[model samples]
Target: GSGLKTKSVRLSKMGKKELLVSVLKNHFMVEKENDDIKVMNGDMMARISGDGVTGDAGIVDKINECIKKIEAIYLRD
Candidate 1:
C-alpha cells in the first residue's frame, strides 16, 4: 500500500449488466463505495441495485481480494 491513486472502475457489466450487478453487490463493492470508500452516497443510491442485501461474507471477501490484486497491478508504480 505505497503511493496509490484513487482507482475507480465501473467494471464492465459484460453483456449481462444485471449479472454483473449481482456479482459486484455480492462482492460488496457498492457497500464499500457507499460506506467505507465513501464515493457519492446519492450516486450510489440512485442505481436500481439488483443485488442481494446479504450472502456468504466470503463472497465480498473474495471480491476484496480481487480489488487488492487490481490495486497492486494497476495502481502501483
Candidate 2:
C-alpha cells in the first residue's frame, strides 16, 4: 500500500475529453505491469499452468520460468 500511487483526475476540466473517451474503451487488455514478469517467472507457473496455453507461449514461459528461478535463488541462501 505504501509503494502505490492513486490519483483522481478529470479530463473534462483539463480539456482533454477526446483522449479520455478513447481510454474508456469497452474492451482493453493488461498483462501485469510489473517488469519482473520474465523468463523464470513463466517457468515457475508451468508447474501450475497445466498445458501452458495462454496466447504468448514464449513470453509466458519466460515470465513463469524467471519467477521460479528467482524464488529458488532466494531459498539457496
Candidate 3:
C-alpha cells in the first residue's frame, strides 16, 4: 500500500509465530490482506509479504521505529 521498498526479516522460531502474529496484530494494526500482513499506524502504513523457510519478510514502509521494535522483539538475543 505504501509502495515502499520492503526489507528482509527472517523468522526462525516456529514456536513464536503465534506470539509474533499477536504482537503484529495488536501493536502494529496488522491485518490479513489475502496472503500478506498489512500494517499501519497513525504515521505510516506497510505490508509484510514474502515466503521462505519460515515465512520471512519485513516492513515495506517509512516507519523505521516500528520496524526496529519488531526486530528487537523477534530477533533479540
Candidate 4:
C-alpha cells in the first residue's frame, strides 16, 4: 500500500532470475516489468523491486535471507 518503498540491489550471478521467479510465485504478489520484478506481501507489507528490497527492518532481512538461501541452493548445483 502507501507504505511501499522501492530500491534495487544488483545480485549478479547465475540462477537469480529463477530464484526471483520462485519466490514471487510462492511467497508474494509479483509484478513483472520487462526484466524487472516487483514483489509484495499483503500480510507483511513488504516489497522487493529491482532497485532494492524494502519493508520492516527485521522483516526485510528475513525475506532477504529466504531469497538468498534459495539462490544459494540453486546456484550450488
Candidate 5:
C-alpha cells in the first residue's frame, strides 16, 4: 500500500499577485521603493511604477509589459 495526497488550490485576485511576487522573489531579486516594484535577474531588470492602485488602464498595460519582459528573461534558461 501507498499513501499520497492531492488537492486543488484557487487564488483570489489579491492571492494571485502574492503568488507571483513570491515566485519572482525566489528566482529573482524583488524590491519595492517609491511606489515602484523592481525585479532583477543578473543583468536583466524590469520596473513597474504606478499610482498605488489597480484597475487603471495605463498602469495595467504597463504591468503586463513588465511581466512579459520578466518572463522572457526568466525563461531564457
Candidate 6:
C-alpha cells in the first residue's frame, strides 16, 4: 500500500473537541472561561457551550454557522 497522507482521520468525541480547539487557537484566540469555550478574533467572537450528548444536533448546526461566519470574516481580510 502507498503511504499517501490523503486519508481523513475518524475522530471520537474528545478528538473532535480537541480538533475544534486547535483550529480556533490556530486561526483566532481561544479560551476556556467557566464552562464555555470562547473563540475571538478582533471584534468577532463565537462561543461553544453546553454538553453534546443530547444537544449534538443544535451544537453541530451552531458550529457550522460559526464556521461560515469565520470563513466570511477571513475571506474579507
Native-vs-model 3 lDDT?
A: 0.54
User: What C-alpha lDDT does candidate 6 achieve relative to the native structure?
Assistant: 0.58
Please write out the lDDT profile of model 5 over residues 40-69, one tens digit for every residue.
Answer: 655555665543434335434555654555
Ranking by lDDT: 4, 6, 5, 3, 1, 2
Q: Residue 44: error of model 4 in Å?
A: 7.0
Give me the displacement of residue 67 in model 2, in angstroms.
0.7
Clashes of each: 0, 20, 0, 5, 0, 0
TM-scores vs. true structure, each candidate = 0.29, 0.28, 0.43, 0.48, 0.43, 0.46
Sort every candidate by TM-score, greatest first. Answer: 4, 6, 5, 3, 1, 2
Evaluated against the true structure, the overall lDDT of model 5 is 0.55
Candidate 4 per-residue C-alpha lDDT over 1-77 given as tens digits, one digit per residue, 9 for 90 to 100: 74554644565567675775676568666666555555556545455666687665555775677777776776763
Better of 4 and 5 by TM-score: 4
| Model 1 Cα shift for residue 14 (angstroms) | 18
Regions of model 1 farther than 4 Å from truth: 1-55
Candidate 6 per-residue C-alpha lDDT over 1-77 given as tens digits, one digit per residue, 9 for 90 to 100 = 75886766873433445556666677666668767777666655556766532223444455565555555554431
lDDT of 2 by residue, 1-77 (tens): 64554655543333332222233222222222232211223233212133243445654554445445544554431
Name the TM-score of candidate 3.
0.43
Local distance difference test values of all predictions, in order: 0.41, 0.34, 0.54, 0.64, 0.55, 0.58
Q: Superposing every Cα of model 2 onto the true structure, what RMSD results?
A: 15.9
Show model 6 residue runs off by greater than 4 Å. 1-14, 51-77
Model 5: which ten-residue window has the lowest total lDDT?
51-60
Clashing pairs in 1: none
Report the lDDT tens digits of candidate 3 across residue range 1-77: 75674854574554444565566666667667767666666555565555422231344432344445655676762
> Listing every candidate in turn, what is its Cα RMSD in Å to the true structure after a full C-alpha superposition?
13.9, 15.9, 15.9, 15.4, 9.2, 9.6
